Write a protein that binds this ligand. Structure first.
Ligand SMILES: NC(=O)[C@H]1CCCN(C(=O)Cc2ccccc2CS(N)(=O)=O)C1
Ligand SMILES: [Zn+2]
Length: 140
């Protein structure tokens, strides 16, 4: 579990969104596993605006923050699960690391801020849904 809180926005994994989120929907993309909903109180997270490929992510299944190297956002085939059939997920970045289903929502950060959130796992890899291209998160 986990979310990013930037301004009046709440960014979560789409497969984990709640009732409150869909009723107050700003934007969602099934192919990216992302959903953004509006909030009453202001958030304090800063979104990174960079091309960093090294950062640190939180892994709830180990209670540890791990430093990682990660690939650039791309279209990656993701196996069928209880949330989606087998499909290509866009804007996904992979790293070598530990990730179990309950790890989705863990933040990946670099020196410039939040890069993304855990979205995929298994086979000794962890995938992060990139948020650095969503420039509108910084305004309105
Ligand atoms: N973004 C997605 O499509 C993810 C949605 C949640 C499920 N996805 C994962 O990668 C989670 C995962 C982590 C470790 C091993 C195995 C899995 C797949 S599952 N079916 O067992 O949950 C895929
Ligand atoms: Zn950066």
């Amino acid at each position: 579990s986990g979310a990013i809180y930037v301004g009046n926005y709440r960014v979560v994994n789409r497969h984990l969104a709640t009732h409150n989120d869909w009723a107050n929907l700003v934007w969602e993309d099934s192919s990216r596993d992302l959903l953004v909903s509006s909030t009453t109180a202001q958030g304090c997270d800063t979104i990174a605006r960079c091309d960093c490929q090294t950062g640190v992510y939180y892994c709830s299944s180990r209670r540890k923050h791990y430093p990682v190297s990660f690939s650039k956002p791309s279209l990656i085939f993701v196996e069928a699960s209880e949330y989606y059939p087998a499909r290509y997920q866009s804007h996904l970045m992979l790293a070598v690391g530990h990730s179990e289903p309950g790890d989705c929502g863990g933040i990946l950060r670099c020196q410039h801020g939040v890069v993304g959130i855990v979205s995929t796992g298994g086979n000794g890899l962890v995938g992060f849904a990139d948020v650095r291209d969503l420039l509108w998160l910084d305004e309105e």
